[PDB]
Design an enzyme around this catalytic site. Structure first.
Site, PDB file in Angstrom:
ATOM      1  N   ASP A 200     -31.033   8.688  27.185  1.00  0.00           N
ATOM      2  CA  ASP A 200     -29.898   7.963  26.667  1.00  0.00           C
ATOM      3  C   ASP A 200     -28.565   8.587  26.643  1.00  0.00           C
ATOM      4  O   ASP A 200     -28.281   9.557  25.828  1.00  0.00           O
ATOM      5  CB  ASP A 200     -30.245   7.549  25.045  1.00  0.00           C
ATOM      6  CG  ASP A 200     -29.232   6.701  24.341  1.00  0.00           C
ATOM      7  OD1 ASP A 200     -29.431   6.521  23.012  1.00  0.00           O
ATOM      8  OD2 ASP A 200     -28.487   6.011  25.327  1.00  0.00           O
TER       9      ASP A 200
ATOM     10  N   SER B 145     -23.975   6.868  16.472  1.00  0.00           N
ATOM     11  CA  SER B 145     -24.560   6.767  17.880  1.00  0.00           C
ATOM     12  C   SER B 145     -23.803   7.733  18.755  1.00  0.00           C
ATOM     13  O   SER B 145     -22.432   7.596  18.959  1.00  0.00           O
ATOM     14  CB  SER B 145     -24.465   5.400  18.258  1.00  0.00           C
ATOM     15  OG  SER B 145     -25.600   4.661  18.092  1.00  0.00           O
ATOM     16  N   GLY B 146     -24.609   8.414  19.688  1.00  0.00           N
ATOM     17  CA  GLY B 146     -23.863   9.396  20.629  1.00  0.00           C
ATOM     18  C   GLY B 146     -23.761  10.698  19.970  1.00  0.00           C
ATOM     19  O   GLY B 146     -23.194  11.692  20.475  1.00  0.00           O
TER      20      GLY B 146
ATOM     21  N   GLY C 163     -25.255  10.476  11.236  1.00  0.00           N
ATOM     22  CA  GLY C 163     -24.978  10.559  12.453  1.00  0.00           C
ATOM     23  C   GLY C 163     -24.304   9.578  13.038  1.00  0.00           C
ATOM     24  O   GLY C 163     -24.976   8.141  13.083  1.00  0.00           O
TER      25      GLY C 163
ATOM     26  N   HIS D  43     -26.363   4.140  25.138  1.00  0.00           N
ATOM     27  CA  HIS D  43     -26.307   2.762  24.559  1.00  0.00           C
ATOM     28  C   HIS D  43     -25.042   2.492  23.830  1.00  0.00           C
ATOM     29  O   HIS D  43     -25.069   1.573  23.582  1.00  0.00           O
ATOM     30  CB  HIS D  43     -27.748   2.423  23.769  1.00  0.00           C
ATOM     31  CG  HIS D  43     -27.264   3.369  22.452  1.00  0.00           C
ATOM     32  ND1 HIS D  43     -27.803   4.632  21.941  1.00  0.00           N
ATOM     33  CD2 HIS D  43     -26.583   2.755  21.185  1.00  0.00           C
ATOM     34  CE1 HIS D  43     -27.237   5.008  20.798  1.00  0.00           C
ATOM     35  NE2 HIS D  43     -26.504   3.814  20.325  1.00  0.00           N
TER      36      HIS D  43
END
Lengths: 245, 245
Positions: B102, B195-196, B193, B57
């Protein structure tokens, strides 16, 4: 022998392309041979504090040195050991034409000081059978000084299957003799191992010397096996040399 | 892999509120994803000198740059690596409607140069089991997404327990798919965190990528779990992509 103080971590990356970085200190029999220009030109394995195994075709003299407890050639911290060589024993049935019988012993002029990061590998018996399809490991600084670069020089590892000599002849033909063994063609290259470096298999929970880097694919392909010196074929010679010197 | 040159220090403050600052260098696989113009939009992990794992995403393109060896974003005095991207491989089972599966691989046009502060995280086997209640680590710059807090721009860490997915459905319901894993809700946030970015646990003394930051709370919440991509469900596709590309 064969039971490191710092255990190796092998992941799924060790099976594919050019293998992966080792955990520092995890292959404590791994040595570098350097010349006087300071150039790393071959690998080898400590089999005790006085004795190193390497390939004959490495051409070692008593003006070379054995380096123990390296990880990164580009590093300065590393507390390594630089050992002088008293005497070089080349196998008398070494054929530089056929690269068969490709083994040298080196007796150090100064004993290695075994620690967490420096220790021996185990030598097999003349009788030991390592079947085709057994997964075994090669390490070294093989992959670099190569092409379209240089870059940091840290100890790599790869997990690779033993072949039969019948199956290996389908890639190398008549070059393959009984005192050799092949490994790879598996989707990973063998070119991380230095010439004279280790091919190790675990036998009774102990890492044991099954092969010595002799030659590989001219382009380091992940579809052509490396060719090793079959230690199990050479080991009565190693035992005679040791008992006599 | 999994073994940093610069050892992480984790105290009790990693266990409350929004975690604590990391020791610089100590999470050496951590990268930042930026665009052409330098907006930090996503995180990632190095799995080797050539490859980064991140979230599908995140919508990465080959314009974006990968930054390695960063600690404080506000410092121009850090010796960081800005790495260009060759190709981008999203997982084709990625469901943009449920955010399931994801994960994306980036192949770098320019290899990472591994050092004391830049190196790789290990990957699990597809059969690895990581129990509920095991304490794992999430790191990142996610606090900077809070534009009008503007925030501390140094790498944070938090220690957060894994949950079983049965137990996670008490929070998010039928959003929780099998290729997901949840962690936290025990008094410390997961919002640090990016994203990723990574969720790492230690297996056999090595730091191993168990999660990839996928989704959860829009504000930092101490009592809601964060939701990650389950790397052990995805790890076959990874090996497969790498082997071929």
């Amino acid at each position: 022998c064969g039971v490191p103080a710092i255990q190796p971590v092998l992941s799924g990356l060790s099976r594919i392309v050019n293998g992966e970085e080792a955990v520092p200190g995890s292959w404590p029999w791994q040595v570098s041979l350097q010349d006087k220009t300071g150039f790393h030109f071959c690998g080898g394995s400590l089999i005790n504090e006085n004795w190193v195994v390497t390939a004959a075709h490495c051409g070692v003299t008593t003006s070379d040195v054995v380096v123990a407890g390296e990880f990164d050639q580009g590093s300065s911290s590393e507390k390594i050991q630089k050992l002088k060589i008293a005497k070089v024993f080349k196998n008398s049935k070494y054929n530089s034409l056929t690269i068969n019988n490709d083994i040298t012993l080196l007796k150090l002029s100064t004993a290695a000081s075994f620690s967490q990061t420096v220790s021996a590998v185990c030598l097999p018996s003349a009788s030991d059978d390592f079947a085709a399809g057994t997964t075994c490991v090669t390490t070294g600084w093989g992959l670099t000084r190569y092409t379209n670069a240089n870059t940091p020089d840290r100890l790599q590892q790869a997990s690779l299957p033993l072949l039969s000599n019948t199956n290996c002849k389908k890639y190398w033909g008549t070059k393959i003799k009984d005192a050799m063994i092949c490994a790879g063609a598996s989707g990973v290259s063998s070119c991380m191992g230095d010439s004279g470096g280790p091919l190790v298999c675990k036998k009774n929970g102990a890492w044991t010397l099954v092969g010595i880097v002799s030659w590989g694919s001219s382009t380091c392909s992940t579809s052509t096996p490396g060719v090793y010196a079959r230690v199990t074929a050479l080991v009565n010679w190693v035992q005679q040399t040791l008992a006599a010197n």
